């Protein structure tokens, strides 16, 4: 009897954490939210390269997409014990690679310290590759 008729599949999830991402707008000299949702460290199973991939709640639109470059440095923000600011030279969330000053804030200092730990582990992996 005849019966009735993302581009993340190549990647291992190294780390996942809820976060709010900001970009600095020097013109207004003010932080602007870029998105809230799961920040993921994705290791490409072909190149062994680790990127940050962050998608907004509800819409799942990309708010960060960049290599965790070995040359990046996580710096505290004056206002927060649970945030990192870093320069990103090439983020492709909005298509064309752009430089940004990012800030990413977590639910807790613990989450932010863990993020820094993982971000450094990712920098080493990217260094070897």
């Amino acid at each position: 009897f005849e019966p009735v008729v993302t581009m993340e599949e190549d990647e291992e999830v190294l780390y996942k954490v809820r976060a709010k991402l900001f970009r600095f707008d020097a013109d207004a000299k003010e932080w602007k939210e870029r998105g809230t949702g799961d920040c993921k460290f994705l290791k490409n199973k072909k190149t062994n390269k680790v990127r940050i991939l962050m998608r907004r709640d509800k819409t799942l639109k990309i708010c960060a997409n960049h290599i965790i470059a070995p040359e990046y440095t996580l710096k505290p923000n004056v206002g927060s014990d649970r945030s990192w600011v870093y320069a990103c030279t090439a983020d492709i969330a909005e298509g064309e690679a752009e430089a940004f000053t990012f800030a990413i804030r977590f639910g807790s200092k613990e989450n932010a310290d863990k993020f820094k730990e993982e971000f450094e582990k990712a920098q080493e992996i990217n260094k070897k590759a």
Binding site: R18, T59, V78, T89
Partner: protein, 208 residues
């Protein structure tokens, strides 16, 4: 596919804030009244391919009204916005609806009660019935908390595409390029990073 969407409703109800959140992810705290209209493309990725809304974000203040119903011509869909913390904004919903449907006779329309994040709600659930006889979809939304913030567009997408199973899908995520640090911009970045580190992140008492 592209669809003209007109956003109408009283001044300060959150029309521009809502659209900006959707365009850039930012939450604008400042009230800068729209002058006439601001038009922005807004794309969503769906299981049926991309949908583009031509968003005509109109002025709700009478003195900044510009072309008023002139903005509504060839709209294919609409959001009527009010503020659940401001009763007058709900009282004016029939006036916005009237002006809109006189120009756009047969379009899917969502009524949005914005600012449900605010504890002291003045337009209570039981009061909000205007949508029923007008066949409007209704959502409680917060541009601030993102409560139901995708629902108006998802509902309109389903209505315009004529597919009630249409979902928003994760927009594909291209491999990002490897970075070459420019030695000439070294001192440039130190500056910019300095300023950013010493500007406080907003809303340090929020969950994120």
């Amino acid at each position: 596919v592209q669809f003209k969407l007109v956003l109408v409703g009283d001044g300060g109800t959150g029309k521009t804030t809502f659209v900006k959140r959707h365009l850039t992810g930012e939450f604008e705290k400042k009230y800068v009244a729209t002058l006439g209209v601001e038009v922005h493309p807004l794309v969503f990725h769906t299981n049926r391919g991309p949908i583009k809304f031509n968003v005509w974000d109109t002025a709700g203040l009478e003195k900044f009204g510009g072309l008023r119903d002139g903005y509504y011509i060839q709209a294919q869909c609409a959001i009527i916005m009010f503020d659940v913390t401001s009763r007058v904004t709900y009282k004016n919903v029939p006036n916005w609806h009237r002006d809109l449907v006189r120009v756009c006779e047969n379009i899917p329309i969502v009524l949005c009660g914005n600012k449900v994040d605010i504890k002291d709600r003045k337009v209570k659930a039981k009061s909000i019935v205007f949508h029923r006889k007008k066949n409007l979809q209704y959502y409680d939304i917060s541009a601030k908390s993102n409560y139901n913030f995708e629902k108006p567009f998802l509902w309109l997408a389903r209505k315009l595409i004529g597919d009630p199973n249409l979902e928003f899908v994760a927009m594909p995520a291209a491999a990002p390029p490897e970075v070459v640090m420019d030695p000439a911009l070294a001192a440039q970045y130190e500056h910019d990073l300095e300023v950013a580190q010493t500007t406080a992140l907003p809303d340090e008492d929020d969950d994120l």
